[PDB]
Design a protein around this ligand. Structure first.
Ligand SMILES: Nc1nc(-c2cccnc2)nc2c1ncn2[C@@H]1O[C@H](COS(=O)(=O)NC(=O)[C@@H](N)CO)[C@@H](O)[C@H]1O
Ligand SMILES: Nc1nc(-c2cccnc2)nc2c1ncn2[C@@H]1O[C@H](COS(=O)(=O)NC(=O)[C@@H](N)CO)[C@@H](O)[C@H]1O
Ligand SMILES: Nc1nc(-c2cccnc2)nc2c1ncn2[C@@H]1O[C@H](COS(=O)(=O)NC(=O)[C@@H](N)CO)[C@@H](O)[C@H]1O
Ligand SMILES: Nc1nc(-c2cccnc2)nc2c1ncn2[C@@H]1O[C@H](COS(=O)(=O)NC(=O)[C@@H](N)CO)[C@@H](O)[C@H]1O
Ligand SMILES: [Cl-]
Ligand SMILES: [Cl-]
Ligand SMILES: [Cl-]
Ligand SMILES: [Cl-]
Lengths: 424, 424
């Protein structure tokens, strides 16, 4: 959520910034509700003043032995009017909140104005794409040659946009996630976490999947024996459980930054999309940071660096892209995307997204920090380090040999019993 | 499913064997439906004989120039009677099938007759429980001392029967699953697999979770853009996707055994149950075997051995229990359970279940083998090698020191950057 004070005091500048990312802030609707809220706030106060007075008058009557019955009808009619007003006020505060929750984050000033993917700016690149001395085979070809990718088996087991990985390919996918977690926990100061893969409605509201993106998720039907408390959704990213670990907390500023990593499957309905490029299930090693507000922009650099180190150590050429206002996620105020070289596509494909979410989720979770005094909202960040299946594609394609074998990157050989190549 | 021929030809012996496991086979209901099926089969044949004859008579009329209109009414009335009969027959064949699918597996003759957990027989044991020279702390205590188990964080993120693991505890849990997969793939001839965690209705019918155990599962609501093909359930065990990989196949007997392993989260509604002992989500390294019918009992020994090797290499004392007729799972014909020593409970707790499922799932999946000649059903087996959270509990409790630190078992130190102990 955005600061309610900016929406009440500077709506025209908020709308101006939100328009840059393609959101039209309905200033007139919002202002009408906001105005009716103040009118109701006063109406309850006046009704309470009148009730207290008539009730103090009913006291003078009971003391003077007067007819204390007409004033009793007066006080009860006021008590009803008060209740109707508090009811209208609560319903109104709920409508404003519902609206507040549909508003995306305000973008950082250094974010370039743009409409879509074509307006994102390349800020840097590393490594040089391999000059192949043969016809480049794609990851589906390479997978099937090695009997390691089986899309038909997954359709039989579940349906489309699912995969079954077998043998050395499955081992490589596994090695990649172990290498990522070990890098981040042993070298980048992240603490490892095993989190639930099903989360509740409060958690989803916390990181911003709710109320607007329910359709992007897999929802589980409630359990018979947990009838009213098991309305769960499958996690779309480890950012969701990880960021919510500080939900409703007041952290000592000296205990910040909190750096968390986790390796989980990720589940996406993939609505609106028509091999291992966009699945319903995919693994990702996630990085989450809880920081002081003064440190989030530094933390974004640090975290992107951590994601970049995975690519560098695996010898995978990539480029760093700053997203434009119109290509960011709902909760982001600034995003860097890392795009890896895919030989078979003769282009760079997204492998990570690192964002500074500002105080947007902290406001929804009421995640604050103290100095050591008064409290204020922390900032949150999240980035992939990395999306494992996309890394596997990149490794298979970039390390393929003329004979169809796949060279195991040096850093993965200890995770693969010292194996030099996939296949014979 | 059981062999339809045993149910039709030897029902009294089938019922006798099923009663041993507490199932009352409704021989009289089944026999009534079976009988009405044969009557309908004949009724359709007679109606077809009559229609063909009257239709051949209608031909003699068209040839002789006779009134070929009454016979036309006769042939169409017969065609209707045929349709009603084929409709009654199909509805009946569906009722019989529905019943066939509720019947549990017939138990092996060496399975002891018993009513519950108290009638299971200990067949062997390994190792001696540690003689503690201090007050034994439980895994919740040990977890919390090391800030590695957080049950309150999981309730906030999702709800009850979920856990959040952090730091060296999460690392140890991770190390355990890596050690298990590496043991089974490098030493026990299992091929590694990355499978979907959501599966379809056919898959669930295949391994036997359906039709009887829908309530034990988490079900996902169908996706808007996959409206009629996304009625999925979360996998309760990797046995489900793994065993179904051979569904509808005819395997060359020389390609058997098929040995598959996988590390997945497992999701159970846990209906009827009132720390890390019975969660809604838990990890398990599963072993699955597809074998010739002559090899399943040998394969059960082999697989239990593979599960036992995990416990031995981790220096964890355990006992091997043969389940009695009344304590087996629906699809099992024979089960060995490995139960590990839990110091804080002064008893052995289940860590693995290894079963010979016979041709029960193979019959549902129509998974057959040829020699490279004619075909016959394969046998399937599955066993935990092992349930990861239960192994973590066992390791934390059995390796705890007087100062609260946890000694890292020798085999896990390479998976934990050479760490000797958890905590300082
Ligand atoms: N020895 C070779 N044989 C073949 C080849 C052989 C048989 C059939 N089709 C292609 N293509 C080669 C090749 N050396 C280079 N290429 C072709 O060069 C492309 C890559 O060019 S590059 O070297 O990366 N250039 C910068 C590849 O994708 C191939 O199409
Ligand atoms: N549906 C999907 N399928 C696959 C995929 C990957 C490999 C094989 N098969 C499928 N990757 C996805 C994906 N959705 C996202 N990703 C990959 O995940 C990365 C990060 O995802 S993101 O949505 O851009 N951002 C977050 O979720 C944040 N928590 C930061 O990680 C992206 O850069 C992609 O590489
Ligand atoms: N030095 C020691 N201190 C304490 C102890 C110290 C202070 C408070 N409470 C207990 N208990 C010990 C102990 N040595 C043995 N125990 C007790 O012995 C039990 C285990 O017994 S055993 O050695 O495994 N015997 C077979 C443990 O569960 C403790 O209760
Ligand atoms: N709900 C549950 N929770 C936990 C658990 C474990 C650790 C921490 N928290 C929870 N373990 C379970 C469990 N249900 C089963 N297990 C563990 O899984 C083992 C095998 O499960 S079983 O249902 O007995 N059999 C299968 O699923 C077969 N696929 C063979 O593995 C059992 O022996 C238990 O140790
Ligand atoms: Cl429902
Ligand atoms: Cl505030
Ligand atoms: Cl529905
Ligand atoms: Cl048969």
């Amino acid at each position: 959520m955005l600061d309610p004070n900016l929406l009440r005091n500077e709506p025209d500048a908020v709308a101006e910034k939100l328009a840059r990312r393609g959101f039209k802030l309905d200033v007139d609707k919002l202002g009408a509700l906001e105005e009716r809220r103040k009118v109701l706030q006063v109406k309850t106060e006046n009704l309470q003043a009148e009730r207290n007075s008539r009730s103090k008058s009913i006291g003078q009557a009971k003391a003077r032995g007067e007819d204390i019955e007409p004033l009793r009808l007066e006080v009860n009619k006021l008590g009803e009017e008060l209740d109707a007003a508090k009811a209208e006020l609560d319903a109104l505060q709920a409508e404003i909140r519902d609206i507040a929750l549909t508003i995306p984050n305000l973008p950082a000033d250094e974010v370039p104005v743009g409409k879509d993917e074509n307006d994102n700016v390349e800020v840097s690149r590393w490594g040089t794409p391999r000059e192949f001395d043969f016809e480049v085979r794609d990851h589906v070809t390479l997978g099937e040659m090695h009997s390691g990718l089986d899309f038909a088996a997954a359709v039989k087991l579940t349906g489309s946009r699912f995969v079954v990985m077998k043998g050395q390919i499955a081992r490589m996918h596994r090695a990649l996630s172990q290498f990522m977690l070990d890098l981040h926990t042993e070298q980048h100061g992240y603490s490892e976490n095993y989190v639930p893969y099903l989360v509740n409605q409060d958690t989803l509201y916390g990181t911003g999947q709710l109320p607007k993106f329910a359709g992007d998720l897999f929802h589980t039907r409630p359990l018979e024996e947990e009838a009213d408390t098991s309305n769960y959704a499958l996690i779309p990213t480890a950012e969701v459980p990880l960021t919510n670990l500080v939900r409703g907390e007041i952290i000592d500023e000296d205990d910040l930054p909190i750096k968390m990593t986790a390796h989980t499957p990720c589940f996406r309905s993939e609505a609106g999309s028509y091999g291992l490029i966009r699945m319903h299930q995919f693994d990702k090693v996630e990085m989450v940071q809880i920081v002081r507000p003064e440190d989030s922009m530094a933390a974004l650099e640090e975290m992107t660096g951590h994601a970049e180190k995975v690519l560098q150590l695996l010898g995978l050429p990539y480029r760093k892209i700053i997203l434009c206002t119109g290509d960011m996620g709902f909760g982001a105020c600034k995003t860097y995307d890392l795009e890896v070289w895919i030989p078979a596509q003769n282009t760079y494909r997204e492998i990570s997204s690192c964002s500074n979410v500002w105080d947007f989720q902290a406001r929804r979770m009421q995640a604050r920090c103290r100095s050591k005094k008064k409290t204020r909202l922390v900032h949150t960040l999240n980035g992939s380090g990395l999306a494992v299946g996309r890394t596997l594609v990149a490794v298979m394609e970039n390390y393929q040999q003329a004979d169809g074998r796949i060279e195991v990157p040096e850093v993965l050989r200890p995770y693969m019993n010292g194996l030099e190549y996939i296949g014979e």
